[PDB]
Amino acid sequence: LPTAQEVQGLMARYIELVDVGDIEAIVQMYADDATVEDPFGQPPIHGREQIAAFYRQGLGGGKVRACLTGPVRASHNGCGAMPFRVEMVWNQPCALDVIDVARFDEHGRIQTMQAYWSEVNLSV
């Protein structure tokens, strides 16, 4: 599994990809059969096609900004967690505070992603 330093780099690179909205590059960061639970509590979506559709819906159709709002917290077992803020228009300018928890596989790809947030974390 990716080292703690590597996890930091990868999770930071995920945020940068969300920030520019490069759907294909985001999807490539995931394992081919990865799961996404976003928001955590909802049923997982499975596989790169479903994940691509998810990101197309959520990012496509307008400017989205995303910045880390604190450092990535990495483990020594290929996992990490990070706090960030996503700015969008829905549907005025709003911001959502999120924490992503990720588990990576032996190939450095995201196997599971869990995005913790609820409506309390949204601001118009």
Residue type, 112: T
Q: Are 59 and 72 in contact (CB under 8 A)?
A: no
**For residue 92, what are the contacts with CB-CB under 8 A and spacing of at least 6?**
124
Residue in 98, 101, 102, 93 with CA at minimum distance from that of residue 120: 98
Q: Which of 22, 30, 33, 38 is catalytic?
A: 38
Domain extents for the chain? 1-124
Does the active-site annotation cover 116?
no
Would you list which residues are annotated within the binding site? 100
Residues that constitute the known binding site for substrate: 100
Active-site residue flag, 38: yes
| Entry resolution (Å) | 1.3
98 phi/psi in degrees, rounded to 5: -140, 150
Residue type, 37: E
* Catalytic-role residue among 14, 22, 30, 33: 14
Could you tell me the fold of the domain covering 1-124? Nuclear Transport Factor 2; Chain: A, (3.10.450)
Residue closest to 59 by CA, chosen among 25, 103, 82:
25
Q: Which two tokens stand for residue 59?
A: 């990012």
SS3 of residue 46 by DSSP: strand
Q: Is 84 within 8 Å of 68 (Cβ atoms)?
A: yes
Q: If you count DSSP H runs as helices and E runs as strands, how many of each does the chain have, helices first?
A: 3, 8
Half-sphere exposure of 10 (CA within 13 A, CB side): 28
Using alpha carbons, select from 67, 78, 69 the residue that is nearest to residue 102.
Answer: 78
116 neighbors 98 (Cβ within 8 angstroms) = yes
Closest by alpha carbon to 54, among 69, 39, 68? 39
Taken as a whole, the chain contains a residue count of: 124
